Paper text:
Ubiquitin is a hub of the cellular interaction network. Previous work has shown that free ubiquitin consists of an ensemble of conformations, including the “bound-like” conformations seen in ubiquitin complexes, thus supporting conformational selection as the binding mechanism. We apply our framework to analyze the binding of the paradigmatic protein ubiquitin7 to its partner protein, the SH3c domain of CIN85. The interaction of ubiquitin and the SH3c domain is weak and transient (with dissociation constant Kd = 370 ± 15 μM from NMR titrations), akin to many other biologically important interactions.
The population shift can be calculated from the ratio of the dissociation constants for the “in” and “out” conformations and, thus, from the ratio of KdG53(D)T and KdG53A. The binding-induced population shift of the peptide-flip motion in our Markov state model is also small, in agreement with the mutational data. Besides the peptide-flip mode, an independent and similarly slow motion in our simulations and Markov modeling involves the flexible C-terminal tail of ubiquitin. Our Markov model constructed from 1.68 ms of binding simulations indicates that the population of the compact C-terminal conformation is strongly reduced during binding, and that this population reduction occurs prior to the transition state of binding, which is a clear signature of conformational selection. Unlike the extended C-terminal conformation, the compact conformation sterically obstructs binding of SH3c to ubiquitin. Consequently, the extended conformation of the C-terminus likely is the sought-after ubiquitin conformation selected for binding.
Residue numbers in the entry: 1 to 73
The structure:
């Protein structure tokens, strides 16, 4: 799959992901591409905040889904 991550400005980035990828794995991919520590990342899907120890499948996130990246720290 691919998914879309929108910053606060609306700057879109595309991520290559797997259905069984954890939120930590997604945070780690955003760190690789944008240099933000996972610690400082808040990820939001359909107004819901995604939590570590859960998969994209757990939250029903499918191909071409859109996550909102917000800064926590």
């Amino acid at each position: 799959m691919q998914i879309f991550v929108k910053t606060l400005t609306g700057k879109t980035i595309t991520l290559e992901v797997e259905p069984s990828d954890t939120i930590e794995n997604v945070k780690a991919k955003i760190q690789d591409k944008e240099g933000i520590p996972p610690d400082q990342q808040r990820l939001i899907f359909a107004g819901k905040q995604l939590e570590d120890x859960r998969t994209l499948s757990d939250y029903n996130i499918q191909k071409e889904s859109t996550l909102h990246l917000v800064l926590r720290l």
